[PDB]
Design an enzyme around this catalytic site. Sequence first.
Site, PDB file in Angstrom:
ATOM      1  N   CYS B  29       4.618   0.953  -2.130  1.00  0.00           N
ATOM      2  CA  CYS B  29       4.180   0.254  -3.197  1.00  0.00           C
ATOM      3  C   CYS B  29       4.225   1.081  -4.329  1.00  0.00           C
ATOM      4  O   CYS B  29       4.948   0.786  -5.441  1.00  0.00           O
ATOM      5  CB  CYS B  29       2.562  -0.133  -3.210  1.00  0.00           C
ATOM      6  N   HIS B 199      -3.089   1.370  -4.955  1.00  0.00           N
ATOM      7  CA  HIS B 199      -1.906   0.502  -4.879  1.00  0.00           C
ATOM      8  C   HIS B 199      -1.218   0.457  -6.255  1.00  0.00           C
ATOM      9  O   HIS B 199      -1.858   0.351  -7.365  1.00  0.00           O
ATOM     10  CB  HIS B 199      -2.694  -0.868  -4.744  1.00  0.00           C
ATOM     11  N   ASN B 219       2.725  -8.080  -7.797  1.00  0.00           N
ATOM     12  CA  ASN B 219       2.419  -7.597  -6.536  1.00  0.00           C
ATOM     13  C   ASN B 219       3.656  -7.373  -5.893  1.00  0.00           C
ATOM     14  O   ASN B 219       4.834  -8.193  -6.143  1.00  0.00           O
ATOM     15  CB  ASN B 219       1.106  -8.016  -5.788  1.00  0.00           C
TER      16      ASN B 219
HETATM   17  C1  0E6 Z   1       0.681   1.118  -1.931  1.00  0.00           C
HETATM   18  C2  0E6 Z   1       1.246   1.840  -0.749  1.00  0.00           C
HETATM   19  O1  0E6 Z   1       2.023   1.091  -0.027  1.00  0.00           O
HETATM   20  C3  0E6 Z   1       0.409   2.924  -0.376  1.00  0.00           C
HETATM   21  C4  0E6 Z   1      -0.282   2.583   0.782  1.00  0.00           C
HETATM   22  O2  0E6 Z   1      -1.268   1.894   0.318  1.00  0.00           O
HETATM   23  C5  0E6 Z   1      -2.423   1.295   1.397  1.00  0.00           C
HETATM   24  C6  0E6 Z   1      -3.026   0.129   1.058  1.00  0.00           C
HETATM   25  C7  0E6 Z   1      -3.397  -0.375  -0.458  1.00  0.00           C
HETATM   26  C8  0E6 Z   1      -3.919  -1.415  -0.705  1.00  0.00           C
HETATM   27  C9  0E6 Z   1      -4.347  -2.185   0.087  1.00  0.00           C
HETATM   28  C10 0E6 Z   1      -4.304  -2.045   1.607  1.00  0.00           C
HETATM   29  C11 0E6 Z   1      -3.667  -0.935   1.915  1.00  0.00           C
HETATM   30  N1  0E6 Z   1      -0.063   3.599  -1.145  1.00  0.00           N
HETATM   31  C12 0E6 Z   1       0.399   4.529  -2.007  1.00  0.00           C
HETATM   32  O3  0E6 Z   1       1.595   4.740  -1.856  1.00  0.00           O
HETATM   33  C13 0E6 Z   1      -0.474   5.208  -2.948  1.00  0.00           C
HETATM   34  C14 0E6 Z   1      -0.237   4.799  -4.568  1.00  0.00           C
HETATM   35  C15 0E6 Z   1      -0.434   5.788  -5.409  1.00  0.00           C
HETATM   36  C16 0E6 Z   1      -1.732   5.445  -6.420  1.00  0.00           C
HETATM   37  N2  0E6 Z   1      -2.498   6.452  -6.383  1.00  0.00           N
HETATM   38  C17 0E6 Z   1      -2.615   7.667  -6.364  1.00  0.00           C
HETATM   39  N3  0E6 Z   1      -3.196   8.615  -5.160  1.00  0.00           N
HETATM   40  N4  0E6 Z   1      -2.046   8.495  -7.274  1.00  0.00           N
HETATM   41  N5  0E6 Z   1      -0.236   6.636  -2.923  1.00  0.00           N
HETATM   42  C18 0E6 Z   1      -0.798   7.464  -2.343  1.00  0.00           C
HETATM   43  O4  0E6 Z   1      -1.789   6.986  -1.586  1.00  0.00           O
HETATM   44  O5  0E6 Z   1      -0.762   8.794  -2.358  1.00  0.00           O
HETATM   45  C19 0E6 Z   1      -1.412   9.418  -1.233  1.00  0.00           C
HETATM   46  C20 0E6 Z   1      -0.489   9.768   0.080  1.00  0.00           C
HETATM   47  C21 0E6 Z   1       0.646  10.467  -0.329  1.00  0.00           C
HETATM   48  C22 0E6 Z   1       1.373  10.978   0.900  1.00  0.00           C
HETATM   49  C23 0E6 Z   1       1.026  10.800   2.290  1.00  0.00           C
HETATM   50  C24 0E6 Z   1      -0.277  10.005   2.416  1.00  0.00           C
HETATM   51  C25 0E6 Z   1      -0.982   9.632   1.316  1.00  0.00           C
END
Ligand code: 0E6
Lengths: 253, 253
Positions: B29, B199, B219
């Site tokens: 995402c 997200h 989205n």
């Molecule tokens: C959105 C995306 O696909 C992933 C997984 O989200 C899981 C999810 C979201 C909504 C509903 C259900 C499940 N998420 C990310 O890539 C996020 C987006 C960044 C937003 N916030 C951050 N932390 N600044 N990134 C993230 O989770 O980074 C942490 C991470 C990095 C590397 C390995 C694991 C976790």
Amino acid sequence: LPESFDAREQWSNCPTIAQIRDQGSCGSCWAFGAVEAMSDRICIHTNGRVNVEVSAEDLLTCCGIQCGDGCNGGYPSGAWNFWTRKGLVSGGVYNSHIGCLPYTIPPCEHHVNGARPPCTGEGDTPKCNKMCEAGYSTSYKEDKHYGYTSYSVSDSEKEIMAEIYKNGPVEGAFTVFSDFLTYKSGVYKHEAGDVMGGHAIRILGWGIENGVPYWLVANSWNADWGDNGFFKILRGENHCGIESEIVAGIPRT
Amino acid sequence: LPESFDAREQWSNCPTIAQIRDQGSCGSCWAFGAVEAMSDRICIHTNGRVNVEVSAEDLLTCCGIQCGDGCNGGYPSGAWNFWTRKGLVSGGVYNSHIGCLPYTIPPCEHHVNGARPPCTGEGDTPKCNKMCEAGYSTSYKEDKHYGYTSYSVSDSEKEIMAEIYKNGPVEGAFTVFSDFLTYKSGVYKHEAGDVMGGHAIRILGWGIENGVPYWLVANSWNADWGDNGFFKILRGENHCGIESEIVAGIPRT
Ligand SMILES: *CC(=O)[C@H](COCc1ccccc1)NC(=O)[C@H](CCCNC(N)=[NH2+])NC(=O)OCc1ccccc1
Ligand SMILES: *CC(=O)[C@H](COCc1ccccc1)NC(=O)[C@H](CCCNC(N)=[NH2+])NC(=O)OCc1ccccc1
């Protein structure tokens, strides 16, 4: 004229020229060879300023009787006429959500093995909706792209080469024998096999191979059929009719 | 600043602005919100002349460490940073065979009851192949599209509105609670449910519905989720952190 030519090198800025689509389980090859060439030519004649995938769905569903009978078959020249009169809205591939009317018939395996389901007969033609998909920036009428002229090109190998050279890819049609269905690479020269039918395509250049002259041709059977969706067919000999039914047309830009 | 705005209507000639993608069973995402907004902005910055789908495939596989861990999750500002340093090639949706590097991870159902398989999330990151798909016009290096700058935008409603109005759609991120998973329409305001995770999304507009001010958001969970793949979320109160992580950038001429 050049001894070899490939529209893809020539107008590299024009990504539709390199694109292979998939007509799916519908006999709409007449529609695909047209909107593929129309897409290329809209880009070529605006020097790149307009890059739109013209919609196979609009043509297939809304042309009506002058084009033939939808997924059962049709006539390339009626497609180019329709475009100069009533035009065609933009439309990407299946589930692309790009443009007004992305194609609705899903990709399938054409005389090959792969991940997608095997193609079957020819699903009924979809109904003509004069409505763009939910999301889309503009209305269906607004989105229309028109042609200014359409014409047949005569059975002359030099004239077809000049026409591709000057103005971009053309649509053509040829007789499919069964031995075509399993082309992989090289220059296709019909040898054996029954008649299957007439098939409309996009011709986008020419060249020589081990001294056999050929036409560079994009088929509408997805990228896993043939040589990444493309094929080469003997040129200069009206081989299977390939130089007999050329049609093209100039966009209103 | 007008009381509503839709980048779709302002830049009606940039069809990517209206396009909904699918990230599939991959936590990419972070990459989707980025390359959707970069595609938009390339078109807005060129006035329509350059109209490409920026590859989520190139960013996801090739960025490496500063973006995070590919299909496991990542950081939006790393994406925009890698865009300005290395650039990103074109790349359509799955099986689109459009551009250098189309997306290789198939679509799936994100918390909805439809015909495609359910997303199983998981997803192992593909490897970075510095090479276009077979058939493409140009080379991987030659196809790159570069950012001039990338920057964060501060938690200020007006700034964020002014940034979208001048330069186009931006990438944002917010905390997802389980009551978001079943959004259909109207303006989202969290009320119950557990925290799921962060997200990253593309913000492309704003307005007021029934007295409630919202952001218009795209989205990357396909068109059958939400309101044709889009959703509106309470604006002006940092709701779920929606005004805290806004990142954007300008494309190189
Ligand atoms: C959105 C995306 O696909 C992933 C997984 O989200 C899981 C999810 C979201 C909504 C509903 C259900 C499940 N998420 C990310 O890539 C996020 C987006 C960044 C937003 N916030 C951050 N932390 N600044 N990134 C993230 O989770 O980074 C942490 C991470 C990095 C590397 C390995 C694991 C976790
Ligand atoms: C190519 C295509 O999708 C359809 C059906 O394909 C049959 C087929 C082709 C190759 C291999 C196997 C099977 N074909 C047509 O639309 C053809 C294309 C152009 C043929 N040229 C001329 N001069 N007719 N058109 C066609 O078949 O028109 C006849 C027809 C029209 C309406 C209804 C039935 C038949």
